[PDB]
Amino acid sequence: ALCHVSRYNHANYWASQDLVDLFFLEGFSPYPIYGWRTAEERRAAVCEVFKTYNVVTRLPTREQYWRRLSNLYTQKGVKAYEPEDPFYIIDLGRVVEQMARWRHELPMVRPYFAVKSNPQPAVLEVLSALGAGFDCASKEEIHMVLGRQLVASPDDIIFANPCKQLGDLREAQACGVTYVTVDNPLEMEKISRLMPSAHAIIRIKTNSTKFGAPLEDVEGLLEAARQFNVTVCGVSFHVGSGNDDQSAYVSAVRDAYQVFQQAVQYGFKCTILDIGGGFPGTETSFEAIARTIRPVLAELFGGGDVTIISEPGRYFTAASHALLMNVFASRTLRLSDVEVSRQAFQSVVSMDEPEEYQYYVNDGLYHSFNCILFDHAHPTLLLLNARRPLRITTIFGPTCDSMDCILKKQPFPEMKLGDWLLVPDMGSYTTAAAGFFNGFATRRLEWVSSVDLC
Amino acid sequence: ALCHVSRYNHANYWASQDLVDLFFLEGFSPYPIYGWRTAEERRAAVCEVFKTYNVVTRLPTREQYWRRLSNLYTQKGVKAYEPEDPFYIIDLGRVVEQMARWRHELPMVRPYFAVKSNPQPAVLEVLSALGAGFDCASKEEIHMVLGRQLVASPDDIIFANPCKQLGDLREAQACGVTYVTVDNPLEMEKISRLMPSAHAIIRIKTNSTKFGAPLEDVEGLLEAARQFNVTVCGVSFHVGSGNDDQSAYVSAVRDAYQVFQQAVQYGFKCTILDIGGGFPGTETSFEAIARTIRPVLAELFGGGDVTIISEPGRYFTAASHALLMNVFASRTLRLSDVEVSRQAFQSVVSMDEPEEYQYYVNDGLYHSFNCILFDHAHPTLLLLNARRPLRITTIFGPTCDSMDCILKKQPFPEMKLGDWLLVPDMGSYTTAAAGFFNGFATRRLEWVSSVDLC
């Protein structure tokens, strides 16, 4: 459907610091910590990134915290940007908390953050300081990771795209990366021809239709790898967020074990297992998924000769953002008699006056709110603010296009010009896929650290 | 649906300049030319733009011309960019021809090009040289128009957004632009309080959900304008990219005349008539639309007191661009028995072997091909270049998103890694709304001139 407004649907619409501290304490589990930094170097590096971006440690539920921050920063902005411009509130402490959670729940797995989730430099810097690996799907992301000197060696970068361009392969081989992912024999030929130092990883299909080799064709994939003198030492799979069944992960791990046996039959001694991303980044919770994944990994890849990695994307940056919007235009329209009857029966809006209240905010579908179509997401609009009766609303974007319709004829509290709209959990594939249509953009950013580090 | 592939659907799928010259011949119509330049200065300015952007004159159907140009500029890359990278072929001669066609069909109307269609500097500069007005929907586009010194005075810029932000109005008043568009009395109050030296233009609804005041509420609009000491001298309307027929244009202009009479009754003497955009850019033809709308303008606004303007967007930059894509990855899959039966009855590809072909190109839905959703467009894929059996193809994009699919399970000639895909008529809202997901972008541009004005 459209943006979720279930927070305002009835007439009476009124009404881990310990984990992070544990994470920065090792140097628990018998597995070595991620990254080349020691215990003292990681904390120093994260504090250095915090100082570099001058984040503010605003210690604290989550909706109340976001509302308080939005009020404070709106007041601050009222007192290089306009006070009515949209802005983000990046909680860089949330990324640290997510890494602490991943270390606690999956200590045997080293995440390789998907840079495609948000290529924002601050999150990359803090993740590299935390010891995370990096997951580049293109030569551009490889350059951002290497150009910022976030990795000591290119061995912490995986060319996770199973279908890479020839120039991308040339740049990756020149830059010195080694880990790549494959799904078809033609990619084996390309990798052998243009990148001889690669450590190819086979991507196996899971129970989408674009990536992942079928379990039957993995034998032909291994045959092509052997024929083309390609060193295969890994198997990867990605299920994507949306698979409600918790058995998809264990089925994929079983398929990976079968592929490992097939590779062993081909003289390939694989040492890398990649379980992909798709983990939930918001509070099927991540704890249940980890409790499902852990035992099969222990009883199948518990020998210690295979390193288990992952490429979690939105998991790290799901709860780290909060977009704020200003309503700057409003008008009321009459309704037809036919439309009046339907709304009276269902909607809790008072239909004495057939009025449709239309509002315009300064961020729409051609920008950060592009996740409605590209990501199939339904974010939660929140009005920070005399009874405010529930009128049927159609919240438009700033762009003159008529399709900028983040809301359409749904009940919502009465809003006037100058009010702010808060959209929590707006960090996954929001500004990465954002387009510069009409010239509007959420250029302003604010840096907040929910946890205390410095 | 999806990208149009009707060019390849049966088993055997094998098998201007004079008007532009007339356009630069003002020193035949009783209307003065557009712009502050003369005949001897417009040609010099456009030749200066061509020299500045190194535009090359290519001389000649449109499909064959685009194929020839694609061959020429494709076997030219392997001889700062990779040869296997996507690129555009911008034909500014097409923009010049579109302007000449507009001048011939509607000599009484001065276009004000919608910068939102493509904010590319070359098209803006060539249009300013041609004498076009400019149509800025945001302060950013105002700055691009003014920053490049394209307009002698800000009187050639219309703040065509009927709902403008406060900072945008402040910048517009500071810059010196006067013409604005209004929809609701709240906008009247905002403009009066913020933009004192304005010439408001009422936007009337066309037989529309987002913009356009209803014909009944124009009374309240005029009352608010008079109450807030707002000077209104124009009425505007936008129809949309596609509609029923020219009867919409006739109804809209008659409603505009009625609103003009209402304003005259409300002590307001108007002098501006804006008929909006939505005209066809590709080849309901534009000539029929002009032949319909000319007589009503002649018999209704033929007194000469009111100047008729327009804001045509895609009309100028529809047939200008031509995107090219490279197939760098491919694989073959299986089909279910149920799915096999469906294709046997309708698909012309022999379904004896359940072969599903999946290809990958370097431009997808997160980029230039974003017009499929944001614009509801179906561009025509063309394979430039033995036998080419039809197969069930699924042309994906470069991004690793599952939904980045421009064509799904449709017949198409057999493709191999290295072939190019030509997509003509890709200049309207393609690179303007294009994002930067995964770091992929069509950075390379090539400049051609179908016409020879130099």
Short mmCIF file of N, CA, C and O in Angstrom, two decimals, chain B residues 119-195:
data_model
loop_
_atom_site.label_atom_id
_atom_site.label_comp_id
_atom_site.label_asym_id
_atom_site.label_seq_id
_atom_site.Cartn_x
_atom_site.Cartn_y
_atom_site.Cartn_z
N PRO B 119 17.95 18.92 -16.17
CA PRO B 119 18.72 20.10 -15.75
C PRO B 119 20.10 20.15 -16.38
O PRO B 119 20.98 20.88 -15.92
N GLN B 120 20.31 19.36 -17.43
CA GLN B 120 21.60 19.30 -18.10
C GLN B 120 21.98 20.68 -18.62
O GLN B 120 21.17 21.33 -19.29
N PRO B 121 23.19 21.16 -18.32
CA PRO B 121 23.54 22.54 -18.70
C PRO B 121 23.50 22.81 -20.19
O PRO B 121 23.19 23.94 -20.59
N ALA B 122 23.82 21.82 -21.02
CA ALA B 122 23.89 22.06 -22.46
C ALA B 122 22.53 22.42 -23.03
O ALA B 122 22.42 23.36 -23.83
N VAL B 123 21.49 21.69 -22.64
CA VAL B 123 20.16 21.96 -23.18
C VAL B 123 19.64 23.31 -22.68
O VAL B 123 19.03 24.07 -23.43
N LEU B 124 19.91 23.64 -21.41
CA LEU B 124 19.51 24.94 -20.89
C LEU B 124 20.20 26.06 -21.65
O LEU B 124 19.56 27.06 -22.02
N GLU B 125 21.50 25.92 -21.89
CA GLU B 125 22.24 26.98 -22.58
C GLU B 125 21.78 27.13 -24.02
O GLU B 125 21.60 28.25 -24.50
N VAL B 126 21.56 26.01 -24.72
CA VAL B 126 21.12 26.11 -26.11
C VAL B 126 19.71 26.69 -26.20
O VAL B 126 19.39 27.45 -27.12
N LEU B 127 18.85 26.36 -25.23
CA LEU B 127 17.50 26.91 -25.24
C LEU B 127 17.51 28.40 -24.93
O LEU B 127 16.77 29.18 -25.54
N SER B 128 18.34 28.82 -23.97
CA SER B 128 18.49 30.25 -23.70
C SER B 128 19.01 30.99 -24.91
O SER B 128 18.58 32.11 -25.21
N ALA B 129 19.96 30.38 -25.63
CA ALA B 129 20.44 30.98 -26.87
C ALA B 129 19.32 31.07 -27.91
O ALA B 129 19.26 32.03 -28.68
N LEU B 130 18.44 30.07 -27.94
CA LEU B 130 17.31 30.08 -28.86
C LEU B 130 16.26 31.13 -28.51
O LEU B 130 15.39 31.40 -29.35
N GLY B 131 16.32 31.71 -27.32
CA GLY B 131 15.33 32.67 -26.89
C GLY B 131 14.24 32.12 -25.99
O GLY B 131 13.28 32.84 -25.71
N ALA B 132 14.36 30.88 -25.53
CA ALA B 132 13.35 30.29 -24.68
C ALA B 132 13.31 30.95 -23.32
O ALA B 132 14.33 31.40 -22.79
N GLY B 133 12.12 31.01 -22.74
CA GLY B 133 11.98 31.33 -21.34
C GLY B 133 12.36 30.13 -20.49
O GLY B 133 12.63 29.04 -20.99
N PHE B 134 12.39 30.35 -19.18
CA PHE B 134 12.79 29.30 -18.26
C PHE B 134 11.74 29.12 -17.17
O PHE B 134 11.07 30.07 -16.76
N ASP B 135 11.61 27.88 -16.71
CA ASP B 135 10.56 27.46 -15.79
C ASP B 135 11.23 26.72 -14.65
O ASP B 135 11.58 25.54 -14.78
N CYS B 136 11.41 27.40 -13.52
CA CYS B 136 12.12 26.85 -12.37
C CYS B 136 11.12 26.51 -11.27
O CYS B 136 10.34 27.36 -10.85
N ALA B 137 11.16 25.26 -10.82
CA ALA B 137 10.29 24.79 -9.75
C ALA B 137 10.94 24.85 -8.38
O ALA B 137 10.31 24.45 -7.39
N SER B 138 12.18 25.33 -8.29
CA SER B 138 12.88 25.37 -7.01
C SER B 138 13.98 26.42 -7.08
O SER B 138 14.35 26.88 -8.16
N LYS B 139 14.49 26.79 -5.91
CA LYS B 139 15.56 27.78 -5.85
C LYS B 139 16.82 27.27 -6.53
O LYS B 139 17.60 28.06 -7.07
N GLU B 140 17.04 25.95 -6.52
CA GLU B 140 18.22 25.39 -7.17
C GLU B 140 18.19 25.67 -8.67
O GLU B 140 19.17 26.15 -9.24
N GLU B 141 17.05 25.39 -9.32
CA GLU B 141 16.93 25.63 -10.75
C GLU B 141 17.00 27.12 -11.06
O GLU B 141 17.55 27.52 -12.10
N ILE B 142 16.47 27.96 -10.17
CA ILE B 142 16.63 29.40 -10.32
C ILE B 142 18.10 29.77 -10.35
O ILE B 142 18.54 30.58 -11.17
N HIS B 143 18.89 29.17 -9.45
CA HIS B 143 20.32 29.48 -9.40
C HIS B 143 21.04 28.97 -10.64
O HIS B 143 21.93 29.65 -11.16
N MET B 144 20.68 27.78 -11.13
CA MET B 144 21.30 27.29 -12.36
C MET B 144 20.99 28.20 -13.54
O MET B 144 21.87 28.46 -14.38
N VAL B 145 19.76 28.68 -13.64
CA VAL B 145 19.40 29.57 -14.74
C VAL B 145 20.13 30.91 -14.60
O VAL B 145 20.68 31.43 -15.58
N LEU B 146 20.14 31.47 -13.39
CA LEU B 146 20.79 32.76 -13.17
C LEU B 146 22.31 32.63 -13.10
O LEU B 146 23.03 33.49 -13.60
N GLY B 147 22.80 31.56 -12.47
CA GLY B 147 24.24 31.39 -12.32
C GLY B 147 24.97 31.29 -13.64
O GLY B 147 26.10 31.77 -13.76
N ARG B 148 24.35 30.68 -14.64
CA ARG B 148 24.94 30.57 -15.96
C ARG B 148 24.67 31.80 -16.82
O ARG B 148 25.08 31.82 -17.99
N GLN B 149 23.99 32.81 -16.28
CA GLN B 149 23.68 34.04 -17.01
C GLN B 149 22.92 33.74 -18.30
O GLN B 149 23.17 34.35 -19.34
N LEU B 150 21.99 32.79 -18.22
CA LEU B 150 21.21 32.42 -19.40
C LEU B 150 20.14 33.45 -19.74
O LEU B 150 19.77 33.59 -20.91
N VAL B 151 19.64 34.18 -18.74
CA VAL B 151 18.59 35.17 -18.93
C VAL B 151 19.15 36.55 -18.62
O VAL B 151 19.86 36.73 -17.62
N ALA B 152 18.85 37.51 -19.49
CA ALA B 152 19.29 38.88 -19.25
C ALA B 152 18.64 39.46 -18.00
O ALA B 152 19.31 40.13 -17.20
N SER B 153 17.35 39.21 -17.81
CA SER B 153 16.62 39.66 -16.64
C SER B 153 15.83 38.51 -16.05
O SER B 153 15.41 37.61 -16.78
N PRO B 154 15.62 38.50 -14.73
CA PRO B 154 14.83 37.43 -14.12
C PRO B 154 13.37 37.42 -14.52
O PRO B 154 12.61 36.58 -14.02
N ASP B 155 12.93 38.33 -15.40
CA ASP B 155 11.56 38.32 -15.88
C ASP B 155 11.28 37.15 -16.82
O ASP B 155 10.11 36.93 -17.17
N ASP B 156 12.30 36.41 -17.23
CA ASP B 156 12.13 35.24 -18.08
C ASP B 156 12.10 33.94 -17.28
O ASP B 156 12.29 32.86 -17.85
N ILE B 157 11.85 34.03 -15.98
CA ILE B 157 11.78 32.87 -15.10
C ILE B 157 10.43 32.89 -14.40
O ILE B 157 10.00 33.93 -13.90
N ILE B 158 9.75 31.74 -14.39
CA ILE B 158 8.50 31.58 -13.66
C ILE B 158 8.72 30.56 -12.55
O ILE B 158 9.22 29.46 -12.81
N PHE B 159 8.35 30.92 -11.33
CA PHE B 159 8.33 29.97 -10.22
C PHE B 159 7.08 29.12 -10.38
O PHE B 159 6.07 29.29 -9.69
N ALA B 160 7.15 28.17 -11.32
CA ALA B 160 5.98 27.42 -11.74
C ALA B 160 5.44 26.49 -10.67
O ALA B 160 4.33 25.96 -10.85
N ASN B 161 6.17 26.26 -9.60
CA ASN B 161 5.64 25.43 -8.53
C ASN B 161 4.49 26.16 -7.86
O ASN B 161 4.69 27.25 -7.31
N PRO B 162 3.27 25.61 -7.88
CA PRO B 162 2.16 26.28 -7.18
C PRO B 162 2.30 26.23 -5.67
O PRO B 162 1.59 26.96 -4.98
N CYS B 163 3.18 25.38 -5.15
CA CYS B 163 3.43 25.27 -3.71
C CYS B 163 4.93 25.40 -3.50
O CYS B 163 5.69 24.46 -3.77
N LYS B 164 5.36 26.57 -3.02
CA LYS B 164 6.77 26.89 -2.88
C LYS B 164 7.16 27.00 -1.41
O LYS B 164 6.36 27.43 -0.58
N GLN B 165 8.39 26.61 -1.11
CA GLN B 165 8.91 26.71 0.24
C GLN B 165 9.27 28.15 0.57
O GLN B 165 9.50 28.98 -0.31
N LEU B 166 9.32 28.44 1.88
CA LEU B 166 9.57 29.80 2.33
C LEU B 166 10.95 30.28 1.91
O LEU B 166 11.12 31.40 1.42
N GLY B 167 11.97 29.44 2.11
CA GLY B 167 13.31 29.81 1.69
C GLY B 167 13.41 30.01 0.19
O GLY B 167 14.14 30.89 -0.28
N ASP B 168 12.68 29.20 -0.57
CA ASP B 168 12.65 29.37 -2.02
C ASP B 168 12.06 30.73 -2.39
O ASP B 168 12.58 31.41 -3.28
N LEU B 169 10.99 31.14 -1.72
CA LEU B 169 10.40 32.45 -1.98
C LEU B 169 11.35 33.57 -1.60
O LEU B 169 11.45 34.58 -2.31
N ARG B 170 12.05 33.43 -0.47
CA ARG B 170 13.00 34.45 -0.06
C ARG B 170 14.13 34.59 -1.08
O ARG B 170 14.51 35.71 -1.45
N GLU B 171 14.67 33.46 -1.55
CA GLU B 171 15.72 33.52 -2.56
C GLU B 171 15.20 34.10 -3.87
O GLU B 171 15.90 34.86 -4.54
N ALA B 172 13.96 33.76 -4.25
CA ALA B 172 13.39 34.29 -5.48
C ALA B 172 13.21 35.80 -5.40
O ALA B 172 13.50 36.52 -6.36
N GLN B 173 12.72 36.30 -4.26
CA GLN B 173 12.58 37.74 -4.09
C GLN B 173 13.94 38.42 -4.08
O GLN B 173 14.11 39.49 -4.67
N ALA B 174 14.93 37.81 -3.42
CA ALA B 174 16.27 38.38 -3.41
C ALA B 174 16.87 38.41 -4.81
O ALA B 174 17.52 39.38 -5.19
N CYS B 175 16.65 37.35 -5.59
CA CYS B 175 17.24 37.27 -6.92
C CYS B 175 16.63 38.30 -7.86
O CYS B 175 17.36 39.02 -8.56
N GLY B 176 15.31 38.39 -7.90
CA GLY B 176 14.66 39.40 -8.72
C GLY B 176 13.61 38.86 -9.67
O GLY B 176 13.05 39.61 -10.48
N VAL B 177 13.33 37.56 -9.60
CA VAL B 177 12.26 36.98 -10.41
C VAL B 177 10.92 37.44 -9.86
O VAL B 177 10.74 37.61 -8.65
N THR B 178 9.97 37.68 -10.76
CA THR B 178 8.67 38.24 -10.40
C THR B 178 7.51 37.28 -10.57
O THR B 178 6.59 37.28 -9.74
N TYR B 179 7.51 36.45 -11.61
CA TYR B 179 6.35 35.63 -11.92
C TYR B 179 6.29 34.40 -11.03
O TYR B 179 7.28 33.68 -10.88
N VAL B 180 5.12 34.15 -10.44
CA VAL B 180 4.87 33.00 -9.59
C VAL B 180 3.53 32.39 -9.95
O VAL B 180 2.73 32.98 -10.68
N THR B 181 3.28 31.20 -9.43
CA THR B 181 2.02 30.50 -9.62
C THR B 181 1.42 30.16 -8.27
O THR B 181 2.14 29.81 -7.33
N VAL B 182 0.10 30.28 -8.17
CA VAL B 182 -0.61 30.07 -6.91
C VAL B 182 -1.75 29.09 -7.12
O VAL B 182 -2.30 28.97 -8.22
N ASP B 183 -2.11 28.39 -6.06
CA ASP B 183 -3.17 27.39 -6.08
C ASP B 183 -4.19 27.62 -4.97
O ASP B 183 -5.39 27.48 -5.21
N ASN B 184 -3.75 28.02 -3.78
CA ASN B 184 -4.60 28.14 -2.61
C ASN B 184 -4.39 29.49 -1.94
O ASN B 184 -3.35 30.13 -2.13
N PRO B 185 -5.37 29.96 -1.16
CA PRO B 185 -5.21 31.25 -0.47
C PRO B 185 -4.03 31.28 0.50
O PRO B 185 -3.47 32.36 0.73
N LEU B 186 -3.66 30.14 1.08
CA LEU B 186 -2.48 30.11 1.93
C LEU B 186 -1.24 30.51 1.15
O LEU B 186 -0.36 31.22 1.67
N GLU B 187 -1.15 30.08 -0.11
CA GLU B 187 -0.05 30.51 -0.96
C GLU B 187 -0.12 32.01 -1.24
O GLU B 187 0.92 32.67 -1.34
N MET B 188 -1.33 32.55 -1.38
CA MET B 188 -1.48 34.00 -1.53
C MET B 188 -0.89 34.73 -0.32
O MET B 188 -0.14 35.70 -0.47
N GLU B 189 -1.23 34.26 0.88
CA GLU B 189 -0.70 34.88 2.09
C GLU B 189 0.82 34.77 2.14
O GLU B 189 1.52 35.74 2.45
N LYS B 190 1.34 33.58 1.83
CA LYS B 190 2.78 33.37 1.87
C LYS B 190 3.51 34.28 0.89
O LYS B 190 4.52 34.90 1.24
N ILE B 191 2.99 34.39 -0.33
CA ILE B 191 3.64 35.21 -1.35
C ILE B 191 3.56 36.68 -0.98
O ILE B 191 4.54 37.43 -1.12
N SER B 192 2.40 37.14 -0.50
CA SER B 192 2.27 38.53 -0.11
C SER B 192 3.22 38.87 1.03
O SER B 192 3.85 39.94 1.02
N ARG B 193 3.35 37.98 2.01
CA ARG B 193 4.21 38.26 3.15
C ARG B 193 5.69 38.14 2.79
O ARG B 193 6.53 38.79 3.43
N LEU B 194 6.03 37.34 1.78
CA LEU B 194 7.42 36.99 1.53
C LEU B 194 7.97 37.52 0.22
O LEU B 194 9.18 37.75 0.12
N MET B 195 7.13 37.72 -0.79
CA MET B 195 7.57 38.09 -2.13
C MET B 195 6.73 39.27 -2.58
O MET B 195 5.78 39.13 -3.37
#
